[PDB]
Amino acid sequence: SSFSRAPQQWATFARIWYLLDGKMQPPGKLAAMASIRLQGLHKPVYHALSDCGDHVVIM
Amino acid sequence: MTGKELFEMWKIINPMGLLVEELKKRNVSAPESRLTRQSGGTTALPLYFVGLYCD
Amino acid sequence: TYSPLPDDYNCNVELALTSDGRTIVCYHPSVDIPYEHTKPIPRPDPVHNNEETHDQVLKTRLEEKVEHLEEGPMIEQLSKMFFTTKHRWYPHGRYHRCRKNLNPPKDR
Amino acid sequence: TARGTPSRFLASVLHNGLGRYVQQLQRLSFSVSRDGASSRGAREFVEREVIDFARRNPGVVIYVNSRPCCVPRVVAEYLNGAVREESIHCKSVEEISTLVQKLADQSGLDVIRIRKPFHTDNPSIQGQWHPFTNKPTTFRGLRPREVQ
Amino acid sequence: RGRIPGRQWIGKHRRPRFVSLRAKQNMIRRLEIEAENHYWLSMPYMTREQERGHAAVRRREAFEAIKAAATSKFPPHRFIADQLDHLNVTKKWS
Amino acid sequence: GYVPKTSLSSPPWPEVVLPDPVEETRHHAEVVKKVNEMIVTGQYGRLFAVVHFASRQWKVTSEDLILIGNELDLACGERIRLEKVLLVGADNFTLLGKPLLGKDLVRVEATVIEKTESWPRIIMRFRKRKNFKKKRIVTTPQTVLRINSIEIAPCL
Amino acid sequence: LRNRVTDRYFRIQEVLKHARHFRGRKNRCYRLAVRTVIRAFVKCTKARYLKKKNMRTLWINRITAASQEHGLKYPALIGNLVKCQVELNRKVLADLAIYEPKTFKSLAALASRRRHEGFAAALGDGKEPEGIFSRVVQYH
Ligand SMILES: [Mg+2]
C-alpha cells in the first residue's frame, strides 16, 4: 500500500462498471445481482450513507 | 512522527526524477510505467493503477 | 493437487497446523501483477493550434472556451455527467445551510 | 441527547503512554471558608488529606485561598489549557477525596460524546480494501467484449 | 380487494394462518425434550416409604430459623454519640 | 452402480479430493518451519493482534488507544500484559489460536492513560395517559489503554 | 402573596436548552418544547437496543460481502470457522474484511477446508482420519 491519503481513499471508494449478459436468463436472477451491485452490497466498505454504488450494464 | 506519511514531511516536487536517480545508484536500469488496472476512462470519476516495472 | 481457493488473486495461502496441535499457521505472501497482464500507457499528443501566420494566436486561442447556461440545462448537464438525479444540484435555504458543521471532527 | 451536544473523537492529548507518562493535571485551586457550615468537609480535607495528596503526585501545584464564600469550589487546570471548576459545597471528606482523585486521574479533554472508542492511527497493514483487491487480471489487460 | 370482516384474528370469520416448516421443527424438538423428561422421571430411587422422615430434622431447623428471625423484630439502639456529633455543624477553624 | 450422465445423475458441485494425510502432515511441518524461520530472522514489521479483553474483542495494533467502560483498580502509568490474544498477524503470515494462542508466542503490553467518567447519558421512560414519567442521568466510569508493543517469539 | 415563586425562568431554561436545535415553535415556546423534549429523551433511551442491533446487521452485511467475494456464503464461513475453535466475533471479522484482506483470505480458506473435511466425513463416517483441521483441542 503506502498509498498517499487522497489516492488511497479514491482507490477505496471508486466506482466499477460491470457487464451482465441477458440471453436466456430469467429477469429476476439478473435483477438480484444487479440490485446487489447497484446498492454496493458486494463491497465490505458498504454503508447506506456512503453512496458506494457501482454501474451495471446489462445487454 | 506517528501517523504521518513520509512526503507529508519531506514535501518533494518531482518524485519520478528522484526515483530514476535512486535507481541510477542501485544499478537497476530504468522503470517503465505500464497501465495495470482501470475502471472508466470516459467518465468524470475515473480510477487508474500504474505499476512501475524494472526489467 | 488441491487448494481450497484459487491462488491467482490477491494472495497465496498455505494452511498449516502445528505439531503440538494448538495453533493454526497461515502463510500468505502477496502476488504481484506480472508484466504481460498490463497494457502500455496511451500517449495523447493532440496539437492543432498551429496556424502559420502568428505564433501567439494559439495562446489567444487557449482561452476560447467559455459558456453560460441557466439553472435547468446546467443541472441536466451535471446530472448526465455524474449519473445522479436533478435534486442534488439545487440550493438549500438559510436554515439548512447555517446549522451544518464547518469544523467537523477528524479521526486520523 | 447526542444530536444536541457536540462530539469528539477518542484521542490522547500528546501521545502519553508512548514515551513517558506525564501527569496531565497542573493545578488545584481551593477556596474554603473559615466560618460557615457549607465548607466543613473541605475544612477537614485541608486539615488531613491535602498534605498527603500533595506528597502523592508532585506534578500538581495546590493552592488554598481561605476566602469567605457561601459555596466552596475546586478549580482543576490541565496541561492543554482547559479549566474545570467543581463545587465541593456541603460534601464529606470521602466525597472530596474521591473528587480530587478523579480530577487527578483524568485528562483535560472534553467530556462529551466520545464517538468510536478506538483510535488506530495506522489501521491497515496488509493493505486497505479497494475493488481491485480480490480480482484476477487477464492477458494484456483486456476488458470484456474487447477485440485486440 | 382482499378484505376480512373486522378484526381479522378474532370472531367467526378470520384471516387464516398456516403452519410453516419452522413451526413443525420447533414443536418436534420440544416434543423430543418432553419424551426424554418422561424417561428420566420413570425410575425413582426411594419408593415413598423410605423417604418418610428422612428430611424432618432439616425442615424443622429451617422453619425454626424462619420463626426466630420473625419474632426477633424490635427498634434499633439509640446512642449519645449521634445526638452529640450533630453539634459538629457549626465547627469553625479551631 | 452405474448411472449415465444426465442433469441430476451427479451432484452439481465439483468432486473434491482431499489430500493424503501423511504428505499433508509433512507439508504442515515444512510450512511451520518456514514461518518460524521468518520469525526468528526478523522478517516482519507492524504486526497487529486481536485481543479479548473486558468482554469485547479489540482488533489492536501498536501505538493506538482503546477505551473500556469499567474501572480496573490500576493507577495510571502502570503497564499491563493483556492476555487472551486469540489472533496475531504480521504481513505475509498470521497465527491463529484454538481459541487462545499460547502465553509464550505472543506478548501484548499496554499502558493505562486516563480514568474518566462518561458524558451524561439520559434514561427516560414514558407511558401515555398513565402519568408515567421517570428520568435518570448516568455517567459510567471509563479507562483508556495505550497498546505499546506486540512482540512475538519463535517458540512454535 | 406569601412566598410566590421567583426562579421560574431557570426551570424554563432547563427544559429549553435541550431544544435549541429544534424546528418550528418548539425551540421557543415552553408548552411545545416540553412534549418534544420528553419524546426526544424517550427516543434517546430506546435507541440503544436499535443501535446494537443495527451495528450487528451491518457487520453481517460486510462479512457476507467479503465471503461472497471469496465464493463462500456467510453461514458456511461462520459455522466452519467456529468448528475450528477460532472464536472471532462479527466485529473483528468485518474489520479484518475491510482492513486485512490477506488474513480474511486465510480465514476463508480455513473455513472452506473444514467444510470439505466435514463433507468427506459425512460420506465416510470417519474411517480413517476424521480430517486434520477437525480434532478439537480438549480442555480440562
Ligand atoms: Mg376490519
Instruction: Show residues of chain B in contact with A2, CB under 8 Å.
Output: 5
Measure Cα distances from C14 to D124, F40, G102 in Å: 22, 19, 12
Q: How far is the CA of E2 from the centre of ligand 1 (A)?
A: 11
Q: What string of H, E and C letters represents the secondary structure of chain F?
A: CCCCCCCCCCCCCCCCCCCCHHHHHHHHHHHHHHHHHHHHCCCCCCCEEEEEECCEEEEECCCCEEEECCCCCCCCCCEEEECCEEEEECCCEEEEECCCCCCCCEEEEEEEEEEECCCCEEEEEEECCCCEEEEEEECCCEEEEEEEEEEECCCC
Is residue C86 within 8 A of residue C72, CB to CB? The reply is: no
Contact F31 C25 (CB under 8 A): yes
Q: Phi and psi dihedrals of F134, rounded to 5? A: -105, 165
Identify the H or E element spanning G38: helix G30-69
Give the count of alpha carbons within 13 A of E50, CB side only.
4
* Chains B and E make contact, 3+ CB pairs within 8 Å: no
Q: Compute the residue count for chain F.
A: 156
Q: Determination method here? A: cryo-EM
D78: three-class secondary structure by DSSP: strand
Question: Hey, where are the domains in chain G?
Answer: 1-140
- Distance of alpha carbon G2 from the chain centroid: 58
Q: Dihedrals φ, ψ of C54, to 5°?
A: -100, 175
What's the reported resolution, in angstroms, to a tenth? 3.2
| 8 Å CB contact of F64 and D121 | yes
The parent domain of residue D16 ranges over 1-148
Residue D38 belongs to domain with CATH number = 3.40.30.10
**Could you report how far apart the first and last alpha carbons of chain D are, in Å?**
61
Length of chain E measured in residues? 94
Task: Give G100's contacts in chain F (Cβ within 8 Å).
Answer: 48, 89
Question: E5 CA to middle of ligand 1, Å?
Answer: 5
The CB-side HSE value for B46 (13 A sphere, CA atoms) comes to 8
- Asked if D70 contacts D34 with a C-beta cutoff of 8 angstroms, the reply is no
Q: A touches F (3+ CB pairs < 8 Å)?
A: no
Residue A30: closest CA among A38, A39, A20: A20
Whether B34 and C38 lie within 8 Å, measured CB to CB? yes
Chain A, chain B: beta-carbon pairs less than 8 Å apart: 20
* Number of domains chain D is built from: 1
In whole angstroms, give the CA distance from residue C18 to residue F104.
15
Distance separating alpha carbons of residues F90 and F156, to the nearest angstrom? 16
**Peptide bond before residue F12 is cis, with ω within 30 degrees of 0:** no
How far away, in angstroms, is E18 Cα from ligand 1 center?
20
CB G90 within 8 A of CB G60: yes
